[PDB]
């Protein structure tokens, strides 16, 4: 009997529930680094004393001992170092062994095998693969989150919540993130395999994927594609031919499914909460805690200025120049991790953006930026910060430029309207908890007068009092169908009657301020006494926004005022109309394998039929996939009705989103929490 | 409903050439690839060509190229088949496909014509 | 390139269910989408199941799809034969260029 292996149990779903990755839809052992798992290996006899055995680990194209992608290691005492195996017990032939990796391994897939000396002779098996991730539940690993409600929300919760809109208006949407479904464990780690970095240098890459602050780089850059490799196509155009408008997805699994079944060829078309929430797929599935952040009124400012220029004509045409300087709303990441390059107080939260690409300056991603490091202005730290600080921080230049004369002018600089209401969805519940307090000081502050300075030193012009004072305010109910009723209100402010001309415009954009189409103007002419305060009606008709409004349901509006031998003053507003509701309604108890009827309800408010009706429905927990379900043409004020089954695979609060589209309402979303009985 | 009418095919002799066409109704034409599809009587479907939702990524059977060229018109809603050099064995039934999938570059086909007939005989 | 390999033919008598398999030549089954189609005779093929295990609006809840990667292979399993279900059925897949088509099989619902 020369010594060998004859089977080897893995006590995979014991070893899943101890390591908290027991919620994947998946068969292998995953495994989180730094901990112990337990084998029991079948030998052929009990060991000889000359004998010997050793594990062979590995990941990777280019395994390194030195690079701590191979390792190998007998039965042993234990280790802190490195990978140990401790035998527990022999009981016959049967080994129960104790396996560990160290906490500062590299997340991925690895192989391991056994080499057995025997008899002046060496045998060598593989034994099996496994995953191995990050380990917030270790205190000495780099993403340890030591409060088990944050643990909870921000590794092992796969239903979420985005904010958007404006700062006039917070909404949210649902987001299936979906990491324990079938398969986006494994799609997640391909990412890294087809970055740059590991096609250029596989045994580099593979070795550097022991730092989260590495791995989160990486995934960052690889949602937003900058070749004809990343996952998603990003399309701000309000044109998406070839593709899903990006209102329409409501999760990350059917994009990374789509990515990965194309061939890991770009999925067309995203915006950046489509980034944000598939980034944080990826982190949560490798086991970086992460959230998904919104930004309101954010600035791209990528020459350090710490300011952005908004461009306007004297007609009160928003111009192209600077349109999308100032995003309604911009949607990050937050990973949690140390930062050792930094050092002990920038630990915690590090902004991950898969958004930017700056291809001049070889930004495929932003960050990590430590938060703490953004809001004490400390731009000189790696990653992006210059960037992400502006992003929250940055002054708005307002010019007028008129294409007559050639001249430009700047008119005024406004400082405070830029990051606002910093949302992240709450523990524990759909709550949006504002987080502005984590990534700036209070407003107007000495504090946030030093940060700014601080940063500002690592990076006409008179002053008017104008006559005139303008505000636009909403009058009744804003919905695509509806008419649009606002009112400029001008006041006179002087000492005298002035004599105030009003240029108008309507342009419907895109949330980042991408300008669409023109679809009403108007001017006006009037005579204010001091402090008489006038009323300026603005209807938009349903006949004209509807050829140009887009998805995002917004419209921008513009009025430039000018009172002879003053400055202009340019008021100005983005809207955003309600879809028409959509309802979702559970028509008996969700229980775990137990059909489950759904009814879905629409009423098409317009005065003409909808057609190329389509539902669409997810859930992590509730159903494999989606549902995509062609509804019939709806009359002009006709109603929808539609019922469907879904089939709960899991037990406690899950999320159920729905999307209907048809030919005139491209995305309206609904969503639903069901409780599923075991 | 989506259509797609096929037309074009005939008896032709080797050597020679045709054209297919494809017209399209009942869903965006320029979101999705489309696929020429044909199938010898009493045997299995085989794949021919494939044009991008833009035109700009084409494939083509090994089986035929050098020999056929896809292409699509947008404002006709249309697809062509340029058959060259044709043999016997091109002889087959010729379905006309949409592709199934919005906005990823997989294939399959959600929705086929009911196929025009091309006959290869001197 | 691969090709899929399915079993030339099935058969099962009524109400019972059957299940018909294609085998990916090289590469992973789970790497591409796996459709299937029927044809009826003198038909043009339907689409039966997408996306591995989809079902297109209007195809009965018996028919269902599924991968094994333990066999490199994709199947369609119809529960609760009819008579109607007799019929050829393809699998289909593709790589990064080109779509593959299995040979078919035909379904006899045995009478």
């Known amino acids: 009997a020369a010594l060998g292996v004859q089977s080897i149990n893995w006590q995979t779903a014991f070893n899943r529930q101890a390591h908290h990755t027991d919620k994947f839809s998946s068969q292998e052992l995953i495994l989180r680094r730094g901990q112990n798992f337990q084998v029991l290996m079948i030998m052929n006899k009990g060991l000889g004393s000359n004998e010997r055995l050793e594990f062979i680990v590995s990941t990777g194209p280019y395994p390194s001992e030195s690079a701590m992608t191979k390792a190998v290691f007998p039965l042993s005492n234990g280790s802190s170092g490195g990978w140990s195996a401790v035998l527990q017990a022999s009981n016959g032939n049967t080994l129960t062994i104790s396996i560990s990796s160290p906490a500062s391994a590299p997340i991925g897939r690895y192989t391991m095998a056994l080499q057995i000396f025997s008899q002046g002779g060496i045998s060598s098996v593989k034994l099996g693969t496994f995953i191995l991730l990050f380990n917030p539940w270790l205190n000495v690993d780099s993403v340890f989150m030591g409060n088990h409600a944050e643990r909870e929300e921000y590794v092992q919760e796969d239903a979420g919540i985005i904010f958007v809109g404006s700062t006039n208006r917070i909404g949210m949407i649902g987001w299936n993130f979906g990491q324990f479904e079938e398969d986006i464990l494994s799609i997640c780690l391909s990412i890294l395999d087809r970055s740059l970095n590991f096609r250029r240098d596989a045994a580099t890459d593979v070795a550097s994927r022991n730092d989260p602050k590495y791995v989160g780089r990486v995934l960052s850059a690889m949602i937003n594609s900058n070749d004809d490799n990343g996952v998603l196509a990003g399309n701000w155009s309000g044109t998406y031919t070839g593709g899903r408008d990006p209102r329409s997805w409501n999760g990350s699994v059917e994009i990374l499914k789509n990515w990965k079944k194309s061939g890991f060829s770009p999925v067309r078309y995203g915006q950046c909460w489509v980034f944000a929430g598939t980034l944080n797929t990826a982190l949560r599935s490798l086991g970086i805690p992460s959230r998904v952040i919104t930004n309101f009124n954010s600035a791209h400012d990528t020459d350090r200025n710490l300011s952005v220029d908004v461009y306007y004509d004297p007609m009160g045409n928003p111009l192209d120049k600077g349109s999308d300087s100032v995003w309604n709303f911009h949607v990050w990441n937050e990973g949690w991790f140390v930062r050792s390059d930094l050092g002990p107080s920038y630990g915690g939260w590090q902004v991950l953006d898969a958004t930017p690409q700056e291809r001049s300056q070889g930004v495929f991603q932003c960050g990590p930026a430590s938060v703490i490091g953004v809001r004490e202005g400390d731009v000189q730290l790696n990653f992006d910060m210059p960037f992400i600080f502006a992003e929250v921080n940055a002054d708005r230049i307002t010019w007028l430029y008129d294409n007559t004369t050639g001249k430009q002018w700047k008119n005024s600089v406004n400082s405070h309207t830029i990051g606002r209401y910093i949302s992240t969805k709450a523990v524990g519940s759909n709550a949006r908890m504002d987080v502005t307090d984590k990534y700036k000081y209070p407003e107007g502050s000495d504090q946030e007068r030093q940060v700014f300075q601080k940063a500002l030193g690592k990076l006409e012009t008179e002053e008017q009092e104008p006559s005139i004072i303008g505000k636009l305010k909403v009058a009744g109910m804003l919905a695509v169908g509806k008419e649009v009723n606002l009112v400029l209100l001008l006041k006179n402010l002087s000492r005298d009657t002035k004599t105030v001309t009003v240029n108008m415009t309507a342009w419907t954009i895109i949330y980042n301020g991408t300008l669409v189409h023109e679809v009403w103007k108007d001017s006006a002419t009037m005579s204010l006494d001091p402090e008489e305060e006038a009323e300026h009606p603005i209807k938009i008709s349903y006949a004209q926004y509807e050829k140009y409004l887009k998805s995002d349901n917004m419209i921008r509006i513009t009025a430039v005022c000018k009172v002879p031998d003053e400055s202009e003053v340019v008021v100005e507003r983005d809207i955003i109309l309600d879809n028409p509701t959509l309802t979702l309604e559970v028509l008996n108890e969700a229980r775990v394998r137990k059909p489950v009827n759904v009814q879905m309800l629409f009423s098409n408010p317009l005065d003409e039929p909808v057609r190329d009706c389509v539902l669409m429905v997810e859930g992590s927990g509730l159903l494999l996939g989606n549902l995509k379900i062609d509804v019939p043409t709806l009359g002009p004020k006709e109603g929808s009705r539609v019922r469907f089954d879904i089939l709960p695979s899991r037990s406690g609060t899950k999320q159920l989103l729905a999307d209907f589209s048809c030919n005139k309402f491209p995305a309206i979303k609904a969503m639903l929490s069901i409780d599923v009985a075991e | 409903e989506v259509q797609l009418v096929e037309s074009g095919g005939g008896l032709v002799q080797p050597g020679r050439s045709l054209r297919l066409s494809c017209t399209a109704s009942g869903f965006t034409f320029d979101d999705y690839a489309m696929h020429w599809v044909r199938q010898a009587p009493g045997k299995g479907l085989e794949w021919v060509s494939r044009?991008?939702?833009?035109?700009?990524?084409?494939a083509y059977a090994d089986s035929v190229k050098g020999r056929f060229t896809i292409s699509r018109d947008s404002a006709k809603n249309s697809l062509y088949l340029q058959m060259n050099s044709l043999r016997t064995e091109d002889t087959a039934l010729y379905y006309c496909a949409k592709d199934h999938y919005l906005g990823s570059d997989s294939y399959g086909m959600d929705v086929w014509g009911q196929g025009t007939t091309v006959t290869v005989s001197s | 390139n691969f090709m899929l390999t399915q079993p030339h033919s099935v058969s099962e008598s009524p109400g019972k269910t059957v299940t018909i398999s294609c085998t990916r030549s090289?590469?992973?089954?789970?790497?591409?989408?796996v459709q299937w189609y029927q044809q009826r005779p003198g038909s043009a093929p339907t689409i039966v199941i997408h996306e591995d295990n989809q079902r297109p609006s209007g195809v009965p809840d018996r028919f269902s799809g599924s991968i094994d990667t333990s066999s490199n292979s994709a199947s369609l399993t119809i529960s609760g034969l009819k008579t109607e279900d007799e019929a050829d059925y393809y699998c289909?897949?593709?790589?990064?260029?080109?779509?593959?088509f299995g040979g078919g099989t035909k379904l006899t619902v045995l009478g």
């Open positions: 090289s590469g992973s089954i789970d790497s591409n989408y």
């Open positions: 289909q897949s593709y790589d990064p260029s080109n779509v593959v």
């Open positions: 044009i991008s939702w833009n035109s700009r990524s084409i």
